[PDB]
């Protein structure tokens, strides 16, 4: 069970279902004006839309998203209208490193894979800020589980995660390249870190340390 | 029968109720009645809510300091009845909606309280939502919980939802002594499944 | 089963044990400079020391207490050094009404039963302040429900409780007499009230109509 | 055996470990060693604590940004070793106490680090306390739980407590490659019961 870096803490999603997902509980509020989020992934199968991590309040279920689709990756911020698609990036069955970015001052969006720029644009959700007090999850969208499940079966994820880090400010180009190193496990953000901030798996999600 | 009434002894971040109607809830004109004996009322106190993923305020009936507010379609649509709630004693809250011209009217204790027109005219209530009692739709799972100030504090009974507008004769008949055997076409008291959670308990 | 007032929510403590107690979760902080408590009780048996409600931080387990002892009732605030005892107030098997009081400005202490003053004194815990962030419980000491931590058996309580209200200021003499009425449980305090503030029974403690 | 170990993947508000020693914990002179590989170090992160109802700080070993602090008796008594903790690497923390004259010394990696005298002389550690790992003493079901900042974040192994002050020869022998089958006379690794809670889990 090799892992990208010295990390020995990787969540495992055996098989998609309507009750499999992970939760995150940031210590500090999620009010963001410009955020950078990176995450490793070893996807097993990709459907029309597979969620890796998603943030959404009660009145807006797509405040933030980053999902795969066949051979493309999509980054959604602010709402369902905004998007950014990189083509022919992810290969099934191999580890890879994904990283986004955003800036509310000018609405500039970016997306990196394996430390090399893939797709970028400008004027995305300009003049917008993500409200605090929402709900964050990894591998699933924002849906209830108190009664009758609710998580659509096709949107779940199956594979491995690690190094899930969310900053709260724009990063540097060199730094985004560094986190993909072979011994970069000891680099963490200030909003959510790996192995520090609470992450509670549910419904079969299990650590594979 | 008139032998049961859900109890809400406290307000917290985990207390709520859930309902599981059988038939699809997508309706054009309906009517919902309920019995409320509120122990204490804040600015907002939900009795029964309804919302989808993209809409949390499809149907609501939330209390105020002294007024009952009926919301259909969304937040921006409101209807307020001023001074007909009294803590510590039973009362009959029930509202009526008609989508043909957005006609709306709120029936309290068997007497018309307020009425308006052109409220969500033509809007169709979608299905696939979650129908709760005493708590607004919010995070079901362990992700915090519902907003504390919204939860209910008291007892409830006789939750009914009809599939068609009700005549002025029908509403009065539901407020009678023996009305408890009357049940709604979509949701019926003592028939539809109810699962109190997080402290709330039945009372016989 | 008759109840003192028109209320219909009385907690039941069937039999004492090492895992029977009630918890309270005040909405607002417990930092108190002068507090007035209150409680209805129908005790079944009284041991050397039976607790009704107790508040204690991590570094001090006896910030506030009110326990029975045979025919006497004790009120402890600040620590074991402070105390106040009435002689023969309590009678087993019948409902009764108990109230406390305290003032940090001078240290005046009082205690009422059924609206008639029983014992009163001054100069205890003078110039004292109760720190916030503690743990509050009804009917048991502050030991810990945690595995490996068990409440001492003899200190538990068995009977009925209702109208548990904790104010945050000294009351009026007439008001203290009012709450003992036969239809007066519709008046409640602010720090804790009966029927609004969370009260979670544990280990067999059960609500009753 | 040293194959196993405890894991603390996150410093939440409910994560801790508990220990249940067999013999009474009332001791006059003792010695405790443990293996720590801290993922992240804060102003104060408890490794293993011990306290009674009146006394919550009978024995403790809490880390600082670069220092390790040994406490016996309460807050007023302390002992600090400055700059001998490295994140991401194994290290061997262990200390000794002698109540006859309050003689204390802290052994790190098998070499003396700091020493003092009159460290709470004559005081007798009482029994009846609660012995935890990675978290301070406090309620878990009521009042939320423990204090978040105190909780640990990393892995631990080889928790041992002895019943007599060790000699300079014994301490080094515990740091050897084959040392891991050695166990203390009060709490031994891999024999004493351990019940991780709130997300903690073993690792093999
Ligand atoms: C995937 O989603 C796109 C969204 O535009 C849709 O056009 C396409 O038909 C979908 N394919 C499926 C569900 O197989
Ligand atoms: C509830 O009512 C007022 C308006 O009537 C609202 O603005 C506020 O949120 C609540 N009032 C208070 C005093 O909190
Ligand atoms: C309570 O404690 C003693 C034993 O410690 C017990 O025998 C007696 O009933 C009570 N004595 C006093 C002084 O309260
Ligand atoms: C860390 O703790 C020391 C006391 O040991 C204190 O002086 C200092 O301000 C603390 N720093 C932070 C960042 O909490």
Swiss-Prot record, chains A, C:
The keyword Coiled coil applies. Keywords: Coiled coil, Disulfide bond, Glycoprotein, Secreted, Signal. Induction: By IL1B/interleukin-1 beta and TNF. Glycosylated. One of its GO terms (cellular component) is specific granule lumen. Transmembrane segments: none annotated. Residues 7-209 form the Pentraxin (PTX) domain. GO terms for biological process: extracellular matrix organization; host-mediated suppression of symbiont invasion; inflammatory response; innate immune response; negative regulation by host of viral glycoprotein metabolic process; negative regulation by host of viral process; negative regulation of glycoprotein metabolic process; opsonization. Its main location: secreted. It is found in: Secreted. Disulfide bonds join 7-185, 38-99. One of its GO terms (molecular function) is virion binding. Glycans are attached at residue 48. Plays a role in the regulation of innate resistance to pathogens, inflammatory reactions, possibly clearance of self-components and female fertility. Homooctamer; disulfide-linked. Binds to C1q. This is Pentraxin-related protein PTX3. The gene is PTX3. The chain holds residues 173 to 381 of 381 of the full protein.
């Amino acid at each position: 069970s090799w892992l990208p870096a010295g990390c020995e803490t990787a969540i495992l999603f055996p098989m998609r279902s309507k009750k499999i997902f992970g939760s995150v509980h940031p210590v500090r509020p999620m009010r963001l004006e410009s955020f950078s989020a990176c995450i490793w992934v070893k996807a097993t199968d990709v459907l029309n839309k597979t969620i890796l991590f998603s943030y959404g309040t009660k009145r807006n279920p797509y405040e933030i998203q980053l999902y795969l689709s066949y051979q493309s990756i999509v980054f959604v911020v602010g709402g369902e209208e905004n998007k950014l698609v990189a083509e022919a990036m992810v290969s099934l069955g191999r580890w890879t490193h994904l990283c986004g970015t955003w800036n509310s001052e000018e609405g500039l969006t970016s997306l990196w894979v394996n430390g090399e720029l893939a797709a970028t644009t400008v004027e995305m959700a300009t003049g917008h800020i993500v409200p605090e007090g929402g709900i964050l999850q990894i591998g699933q969208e924002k849906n209830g589980c108190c009664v009758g499940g609710g998580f659509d079966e096709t949107l779940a994820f199956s594979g491995r995660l690690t190094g899930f880090n969310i900053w709260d400010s724009v990063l540097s180009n060199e730094e985004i390249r560094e986190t993909g190193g072979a011994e970069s496990c000891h680099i963490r953000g200030n909003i959510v870190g790996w192995g520090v901030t609470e992450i509670q798996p549910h419904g079969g999600a299990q650590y594979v340390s």
